[PDB]
Amino acid sequence: MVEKRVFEMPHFTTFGGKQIKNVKVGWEAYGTLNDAKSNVILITHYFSGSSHAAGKYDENDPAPGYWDSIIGPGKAIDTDRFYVISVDTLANLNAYDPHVITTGPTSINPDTGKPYGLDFPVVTIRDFVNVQKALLESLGISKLYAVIGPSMGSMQAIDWASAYPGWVERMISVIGAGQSDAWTTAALEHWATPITLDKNWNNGAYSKEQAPLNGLAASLMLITQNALTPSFFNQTGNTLGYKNVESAPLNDIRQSHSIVNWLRERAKTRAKSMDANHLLYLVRACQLFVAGHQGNLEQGLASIKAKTLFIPAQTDLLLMPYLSQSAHQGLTSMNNDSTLVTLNGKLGHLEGVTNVSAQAQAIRQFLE
Amino acid sequence: MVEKRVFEMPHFTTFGGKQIKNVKVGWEAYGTLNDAKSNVILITHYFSGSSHAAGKYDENDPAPGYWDSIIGPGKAIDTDRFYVISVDTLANLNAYDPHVITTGPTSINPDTGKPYGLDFPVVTIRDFVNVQKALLESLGISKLYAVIGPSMGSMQAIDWASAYPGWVERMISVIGAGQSDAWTTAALEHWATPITLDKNWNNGAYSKEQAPLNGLAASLMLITQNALTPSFFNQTGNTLGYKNVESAPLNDIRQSHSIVNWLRERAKTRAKSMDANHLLYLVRACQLFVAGHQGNLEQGLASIKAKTLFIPAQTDLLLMPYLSQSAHQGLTSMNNDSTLVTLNGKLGHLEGVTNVSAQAQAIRQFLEN
């Protein structure tokens, strides 16, 4: 049911005033664009995700897109009513996934025949929304009925609403934020440092054959944990038969606890088709984020005219609930039709990826 | 006004079945040990701490020990009533600080004339309390009026109360836990990875002048943030003129935001007298922690008779509210005299290290009954 597409720009100016030549990003869409091009809902994807917000590329895919549970016929993001479209970001974390098309440190520089590495220009949330704007424009679309996104994708969505206020009628921020505050910028740095310390990194110039695999796995382990909760780790801890006094980490400083070996293996398996530098660039992109990318959060919220719906996860330890509450109460103070509802499950940040359906009615009522 | 002392054990068995020779740990004490040795209050110290719970070694020390505000004459922990003693952990993180005395990776192995590196045996919190016990025994003490400690210090404290019930009349746990659950064990593992990724680490066999400095700083950055809150970082960012679109990290992948530069320098500063391998070992000793060191916390709680006070910080992100609650509730279901008061401040975990005084009276009344 899903066909992967590719959007290309020969020229593109980054928000930081750099040039990327030969941009290529993947994208996909579900449903039908109506005649007025007035039923467009942009899904903007989270830190490690891609355009694959729903559906499957192949029957044999082990699982559909991450928001399949609320995107489809008759679902809260109804594909019988909306042309639902999603775009791979630049510097997409899954640079070596056969379905992900991105421009970033792995792209070949024609000028050396070698990957850009850390020669790639700094990219931002705005750069993502601007690549999405160009894709939309090239499809004759001038307005968004809604933009919807979780986590890093809620940054894109709220940025859209702020940067192009006449372009967005509705803004759904899920497990989200209006800014990367100093707490969040610091927290996200720790995802980056494991890769800088890996000896293979070679200041970003490593080959694919000598990639910084350990630093990447180390980053994902930290990410994976930040995105969950004590509850989740203690329950999987139970399944592993976790104990404080395990003979292996007790006897050998170089062995680890059951729960660590699990997280390491999981993150290693999650990072096979990922790229270390691309993780670095998405980190920096998040650290630079503020709705509207103007002086501060208040200025960016003053530009929004879309009604706003904020769905924090109550358990979220990564983009914590006060983030959604900050943007939401700043908006109502400006007489923005702003609504806040909570996700309150046990997966923490990942409630808003894996179980956004819990709030499907709020999304639906917002979208009627 | 506080003399740093040394305790020595020619031979020490570890909890993991191994030997360490020339065990040397630092300690100090405040107050006067009564004729009965019944007024002994042991302070056990947190991850990056030392024995310096109060007072100053030199009156021109910039800052007194980390609990001077509640340990001293006439304070909640009255050092004209109690004898207040505190010992440096094995593998103490402050491996190059002139006041700490410890034994670990940087120690010279007398068998080889060279450092232990990661030949040092794995240490646990049990090994910390046992070195304390050995010190207390060397001093002729047989019983502790109170064992108190924040964080890793509370791990030692509740361990003391579970492994040696009659030794411990009262146990005060501050910003602490009964155990390192799976969440917390994985969480501290992230403290360890950056050190081990650093090329200079060399599987633990680096010279002091060829240390994995950038890995060590990485760990400390994470630790520092884990110990704090958004409020602190956001007040801090505001003191720093933090903006989200700062021109330095926007123009250059290799530049960083204000907050990160602050965080990095504070960690490189905190790391001057620290050793990397010792950090690995304290992390592992924390992952191995369960009060008592049985197969679970319930078994470790079941043998506690000391009356217990718990003082978690509501805003703690490192050892969150629930770890104290899980232990306090377990003890109350065992009809153990267990109280729980909360620190409400916004420094998170470090409420219980730098602002314990907010519960001075609860501690005072728990000690004075």
Say if residues B112 and B61 touch (Cβ distance below 8 Å).
no
Structure tokens at B318: 């490192």
Distances (CA, A) of B226 to B30, B151, B220, B301: 31, 13, 10, 27
Rounded distance between C-alpha atoms, residue B179 and residue B293, angstroms: 9
Separation CA A103–CA A92 (nearest Å): 8
Please tell me the total count of domains within chain A. 1
Write b or e for each residue in B178-211: b if 16 or more Cβ atoms lie within 10 A of its Cβ, otherwise e: bbbbbbbbbbbbbbbbbbbbbebbeebebeeeeb
What is d(CA B174, CA B340) in angstroms, rounded to the nearest whole number?
10
d(CA A44, CA A88): 8
Distance in angstroms (rounded) separating the CA atoms of residues B194 and B206: 15
Q: Spell out which residues of chain A touch residue B225, defining contact as CB-CB under 8 Å.
A: 183, 186-187, 190
Experimentally determined by: X-ray
Do the Cβ atoms of A183 and B234 come within 8 Å? Answer: yes
Please, how many CA atoms are within 13 Å of residue B289, restricted to the half-sphere of its CB? 34
Q: Where are the beta strands (DSSP E) in chain A?
A: 5-13, 19-30, 40-43, 71-72, 77-78, 83-87, 108-109, 114-115, 146-150, 170-174, 307-311, 338-340
| Cα–Cα distance, B168 to B143 (Å, whole number) | 6
> CA of A139 to nearest chain B CA: how many angstroms apart?
30
Answer whether A33's CB lies under 8 Å from A39's CB.
Answer: yes
**CA–CA–CA angle B144, B145, B146 (5° rounding):** 90
Q: How many residues does chain A have?
A: 368
DSSP A299-337: HHHHT--SEEEEE-BTT-SSS-HHHHHHHHHHHHTTT--
For chain B, the distance separating the N- and C-terminal CA atoms, rounded to the nearest angstrom, is 29
B327 touches chain A (CB under 8 A): no
A333/A310 Cα distance (integer angstroms) = 15
B 135-154 residues inside an 8 A Cβ radius of A? none
For A16, the closest of B189, B197, B250 (CB atoms) is: B250
Helix/strand/coil percent split, chain B, to 5: 40, 15, 45
User: How far lies A317's CA from each of A122, B19, B315, in Å?
Assistant: 27, 41, 12
Q: A270 φ, ψ to 5°?
A: -75, -20
Whether B198 and chain A come into contact, CB under 8 Å, resolves to yes
Strand, helix or coil for residue B98: coil
Q: How many of the other CB atoms lie within 10 Å of CB of A334?
A: 13
- Note down the domain range covering A362: 1-368
Q: What's the distance, CA A368 to chain centroid?
A: 25
Structure tokens at A55: 């559906």
Of B3, B221, B29, the closest CA to residue B99 belongs to B3
d(C-alpha B25, C-alpha B19), whole Å:
16
Compute CA distances B170 → A100, B338, B339, B366, whole Å.
Answer: 60, 10, 11, 8
Q: What is the DSSP string of B282-301?
A: HHHHHHT-BTTSSSSHHHHH
Contact A124 B215 (CB under 8 A): no
List the one residue out of A322, A314, A307 whose CA is nearest residue A358. Answer: A314
Residue entry with tokens 């006060």: A322
If you search the block for the tokens 């903006």, which residue do you land on?
A: B243
> In this structure, what token pair is assigned to residue B250?
């926007």
Question: With an 8 Å Cβ cutoff, are B322 and A189 in contact?
Answer: no
Taking residue B338's Cβ as centre, other Cβ atoms within 10 Å add up to 22
Structural tokens at position A25: 């990003």
C-alpha torsion angle, residues A155, A157, A161, A163 (rounded to 10): 60
Q: Which two tokens stand for residue B185?
A: 């064990």
* Mutation choice for B interface testing from A244, A257, A264, A277 by most B CBs within 10 A: A244
B316 belongs to the catalytic site? yes
For residue B214, give the DSSP letter. Answer: H
CA angle A347, A363, A166 (to 5 degrees): 120
Cα(A195)–Cα(A274) distance, rounded to whole angstroms? Answer: 12
Q: What is the bridge-based pairing of β-strands A40-43 and A108-109? A: unpaired
- Helix ranges (DSSP H) in chain B: 125-138, 152-163, 182-197, 213-226, 230-239, 247-251, 258-270, 276-287, 297-302, 321-333, 351-354, 360-367
Q: What amino acid occupies position A367?
A: L
Q: Measure the CA–CA gap between A237 and A244, rounded to whole angstroms.
A: 11
Q: What angle do CA A208, A211, A215 make, to 5 degrees?
A: 155
Q: How many CA atoms lie within 13 A of A172 on its CB side?
A: 29
Are A2 and A57 within 8 A, CB to CB? yes
The interface residues of chain A toward chain B in range 263-282, judged by CB-CB distance below 8 A, are 263, 280-281
Angle in degrees, CA B312, B317, B323, rounded to 5: 45
**A68 belongs to the catalytic site:** no
